[PDB]
């Protein structure tokens, strides 16, 4: 319920952020995924490509300014008994196109958690075209902590990671 739409970020917090992704549902499962809006320009969801469960929550059409949005999945009997998986990418006021990327580490204890974001410059729609940028274009890797970079369209992004349980990895771009 409380998902699907965050604040500016300057009143995130985990303690609450915890909760907030069990108001879903009474589940063993927990994922956060979303991007804090703040560079100035409204933006446009398109697609959402998705292997998880199925959906549980409405994705945000259009983000306000200085604002942010989460989402949600299910794992059921998809690619996982427990978490959610999707990438999908938002339209940017500049005719870019950001691409999140989130998972559920938390059945893969054989490697650490991987991530990645990028912003696919003009139009891409969420497919396996978004996913294979992720995958194979260039995966990365974190283990608890901040990291930030420019990369390379006029913004720059950082991305954070967190391991164990009530943990998940977000991405925040800004100017």
């Given amino acids: 319920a409380l998902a699907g739409t965050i604040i500016a970020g300057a009143s995130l917090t985990f303690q609450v952020l915890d909760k907030v992704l069990?108001?879903?549902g009474k589940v063993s499962q927990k994922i956060a995924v979303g991007i804090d809006?703040?560079?100035?320009?409204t933006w446009t969801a398109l697609n959402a490509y998705f292997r998880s469960g199925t959906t549980d929550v409405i994705l945000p059409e259009f983000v306000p300014n200085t604002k942010a949005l989460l989402y949600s999945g299910r794992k059921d009997t998809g690619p996982v008994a427990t978490g959610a998986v999707a990438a999908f990418a938002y339209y940017m006021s500049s005719g870019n196109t950001l691409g999140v990327m989130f998972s559920v580490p938390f059945d893969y204890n054989w490697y650490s958690n991987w991530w990645d974001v990028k912003i696919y410059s003009g139009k891409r729609r969420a497919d396996q075209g978004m996913y294979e940028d992720l995958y194979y274009g260039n995966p990365y890797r974190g283990d608890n902590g901040w990291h930030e970079k420019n990369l390379g369209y006029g913004l720059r992004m950082k991305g954070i990671m967190?391991?164990?349980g009530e943990a998940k990895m977000q991405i925040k771009i800004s100017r």
């Fill in 37 to 41: 809006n703040e560079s100035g320009g």
């Fill in 162 to 164: 967190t391991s164990a």
């Fill in 22 to 24: 069990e108001e879903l």
